[PDB]
Design a protein around this motif. Structure first.
Motif, short mmCIF file in Angstrom:
data_model
loop_
_atom_site.label_atom_id
_atom_site.label_comp_id
_atom_site.label_asym_id
_atom_site.label_seq_id
_atom_site.Cartn_x
_atom_site.Cartn_y
_atom_site.Cartn_z
N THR A 1 8.57 18.86 -20.71
CA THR A 1 8.36 20.04 -19.86
C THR A 1 7.54 21.08 -20.60
O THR A 1 7.32 20.97 -21.83
N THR A 2 7.08 22.07 -19.85
CA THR A 2 6.30 23.17 -20.38
C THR A 2 6.60 24.42 -19.54
O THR A 2 7.45 24.37 -18.64
N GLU A 3 5.89 25.51 -19.81
CA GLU A 3 6.17 26.82 -19.18
C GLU A 3 5.54 26.96 -17.80
O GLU A 3 4.44 26.41 -17.56
N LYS B 1 5.41 18.52 -17.67
CA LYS B 1 4.04 18.60 -18.20
C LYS B 1 3.11 17.56 -17.58
O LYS B 1 1.90 17.83 -17.43
N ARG C 1 11.48 25.63 -15.79
CA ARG C 1 10.46 24.94 -16.56
C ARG C 1 9.72 24.02 -15.59
O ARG C 1 10.20 23.80 -14.47
N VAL D 1 14.22 22.33 -13.70
CA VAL D 1 12.94 21.74 -13.98
C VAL D 1 12.23 21.45 -12.66
O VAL D 1 12.78 20.78 -11.80
#
Length: 222
Positions: free
Chosen positions: A46-48, A37, A34, A84
């Motif tokens: 977090t994001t993709e 963000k 991940r 992450v």
């Protein structure tokens, strides 16, 4: 009529790769990844990842372009235990940009160099073939699962390529046996995504500049 899919891109990357010891990440490892963000290190949201980055890591985490230089090396320094990717911050590039690398003043004494506005998106650093800095700009993914690319040169920071896919097609175009040149890469779908990206992210780009407190400290120096 040109085919600019991620699948096609990876075949071309396999074709030019100068790394003699390819080291793919496994599917399982890639699945856990991940990215933060936001630029703010204390914000844990977090994001993709973009699809391009996952496909590159799945092929060779140590790939070297047709320029015999890395692309995704630096970003691996940001990956924690949980998988992450922590944000990169462009303070060193900014500091060097106004020539402060020759000042004899440690960057730490003048932090923050760049804006730390709480809205700023995360960055993933991409290793580049020239003097400019290249970043994946972690705002919103597009229809292909990509984020925009940002560039920084000296004191300037701007949204550039539509994605890492466009960036890499351009890097790879200089190879003679590759089947295309830079003149084949003026694709309307890329321009259209760049226009979308700029509209969507304009308010954030407007925040990308030197910190006011950095100017204040520089003005106060004797």
């Amino acid at each position: 009529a040109m085919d600019i899919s991620l699948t096609n891109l990876i075949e071309l990357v396999k074709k030019v790769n100068r790394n003699k010891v390819p080291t793919p990440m496994s599917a399982e490892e890639i699945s856990r990844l991940r990215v933060r963000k936001y630029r703010d290190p204390q914000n844990t949201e977090t994001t993709e990842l973009p699809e391009s980055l996952k496909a590159l890591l799945a092929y060779d985490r140590d790939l070297l372009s047709n320029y015999n230089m890395p692309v995704i090396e630096t970003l691996q320094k940001s990956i924690d235990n949980e998988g992450v990717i922590h944000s990169y911050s462009p303070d060193e590039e900014a500091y060097y940009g106004v020539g402060m690398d020759s000042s004899g003043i440690d960057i730490e004494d003048l932090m923050p160099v760049w804006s730390n506005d709480p809205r700023l998106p995360a960055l993933i650093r991409i290793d580049h073939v020239g003097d400019q800095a290249i970043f994946i700009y972690i705002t919103e993914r597009d229809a292909n699962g990509e984020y925009p690319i940002a560039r920084m040169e000296r004191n300037e920071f701007w949204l550039a390529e539509s994605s890492l896919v466009e960036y890499l097609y351009n890097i790879i175009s200089g190879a003679k046996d590759i089947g295309f040149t830079e003149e084949d890469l003026h694709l309307p779908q890329w321009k259209a995504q760049q226009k979308m990206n700029e509209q969507r992210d304009a308010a954030l780009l407007d925040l990308e500049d030197y910190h006011e407190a950095f100017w204040a400290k520089l003005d106060a120096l004797v």
